[PDB]
């Protein structure tokens, strides 16, 4: 069973690296959101004020379900781990 | 201990599936960001140019802390794995 231990260890380490990469993607995503906010706040709003629809509901619904699936998988992971103590 | 091996294997596989689902959520998120950028760049900016605040600091701070927590948990995961070699 020593090889099984070695393989699980390597598998866990690769899982953790994948998680690190998603975290980085999220930080980069915020930078993009802030960049867009920046341009709107710096140029679009001031110009309109001097002079004086966006429908993504289907996309947000798709994202909500995808995130929920992630929850369903983690919950199942935890159930299996409880069987180790016995 | 054979059952413990089987349970850890199943638990790891479910963890990996949850990671895949988060990746998909992130790709969909970018599609949404690009869609919004698209409408701004295609209609809002051109119209204002022909004619011629957004405060989310508290939300971004909340996201930064949540992402940091993810880092704190992975670091702890790695510390435990080092105890396997002994």
């Amino acid at each position, epitope marked *: 069973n020593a090889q099984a231990i070695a393989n699980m260890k390597n598998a866990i380490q690769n899982t953790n690296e994948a998680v690190k990469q998603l975290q980085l993607a999220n930080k980069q995503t915020l930078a993009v959101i802030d960049t867009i906010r920046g341009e709107i706040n710096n140029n679009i709003i001031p110009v309109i004020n001097q002079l004086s629809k966006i429908d993504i509901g289907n996309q947000l619904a798709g994202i909500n379900q995808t995130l929920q699936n992630a929850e369903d998988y983690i919950e199942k992971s935890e*159930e299996f781990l409880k069987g180790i103590n016995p | 201990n054979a059952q413990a091996i089987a349970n850890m294997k199943n638990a790891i596989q479910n963890t990996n599936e949850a990671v895949k689902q988060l990746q998909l959520a992130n790709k969909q998120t970018l599609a949404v960001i690009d869609t919004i950028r698209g409408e701004i760049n295609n209609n809002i900016i051109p119209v204002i140019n022909q004619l011629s605040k957004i405060d989310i600091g508290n939300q971004l701070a909340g996201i930064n802390q949540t992402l940091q927590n993810a880092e704190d948990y992975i670091e702890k995961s790695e510390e435990f794995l080092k105890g396997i070699n002994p």
Partner: antibody
Amino acid sequence: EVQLQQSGADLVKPGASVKLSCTASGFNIKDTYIHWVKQRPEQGLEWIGRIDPANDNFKYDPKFQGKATITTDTSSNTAYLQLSSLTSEDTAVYYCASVITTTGYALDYWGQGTSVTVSS
Amino acid sequence: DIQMTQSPASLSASVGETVTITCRASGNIHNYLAWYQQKQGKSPQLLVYSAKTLADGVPSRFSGSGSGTQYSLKINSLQPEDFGSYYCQHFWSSPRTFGGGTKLEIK
């Protein structure tokens, strides 16, 4: 061996509160999930909900979310189902069930069930 | 949510006959389906889990298979002791509900 010993035989008036319970033998409550199921006399089975005694993490079928709650006492290896606002429909048989060997797949052990009735 | 449909309301068969019970899902269960049996009284017991397996102690007379949203149970060479009520439920996400159930009688 592993078993669930369920108890109760509550005869109550409409509007009454009822507490049903089960105890474990042969295993530690902390290492398992406890589920509750409601069987109306002739109408199949409805899942109520379950708890994780390790951290009192509960989850319920929305149908009973405002009807009943599930709690536990780890130190005595026991579990409880608290029913409120009992009416005629609630007359039924409740079962305590747990997952022992078939982890992640199916309810394994069941209690004998407890019957609670509501009458004037 | 994900609901289960137990199609046969009631089956009627003599001893030695082969019958089947079919169960369908309103969504993808990822093969986390289990079958239970109950007598006229007493608690139910687990017969098949993971929808492709047998529970410990269960006779080879009981088997099953399926995928996606379509699953089934088969009972070969029915014996007098095999007559009772059958149920299907899933263990994916929540709520982990049950199908209506099928009653198999001797006749």
